[PDB]
Amino acid sequence: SGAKFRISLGLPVGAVINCADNTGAKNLYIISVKGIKGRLNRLPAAGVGDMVMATVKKGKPELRKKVHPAVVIRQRKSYRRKDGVFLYFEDNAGVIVNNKGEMKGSAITGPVAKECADLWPRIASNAGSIA
């Protein structure tokens, strides 16, 4: 029933964010953002809590050379919340997820933004810190 309350997007296609789970992956190369209609010459961009298609560039060879769904956990871009506070996380992070929203890993390193925690209950279940 809750909304999304769109925020600033600072992770376009081609951004490489570090993975924050114990799967074994080190980086997540974003190749596209789910739910983007698109505009001419406009690169799709992803905020925190958005499903993306990502590829592992370095890490376990099993995860490499294929496409994995992912959800952004943190971003360095400062985004405005409805209470008027601008927040950023000093690093861009994400976790490998499946189509239905169940995380592939079992633990999350670092805090998780409250938008992603509210939007994805499975991620918030394993989240150590919120916002």
Binding site: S78, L87, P111
Partner: protein
Amino acid sequence: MKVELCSFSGYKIYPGHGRRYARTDGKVFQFLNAKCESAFLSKRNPRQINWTVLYRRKHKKGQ
């Protein structure tokens, strides 16, 4: 509303103003403006900066 205290200077932060910073280790800091944020990100010690409240408390300024 809950007013916050700047992590570097020490002044109160009102809901409209300020900026929130979340570190990877799991700690959150509040800054008045880009001046205090830049001072914090540069690893400058607030007790060595004259206009900060912590410096005045250290040197017993005023009162």
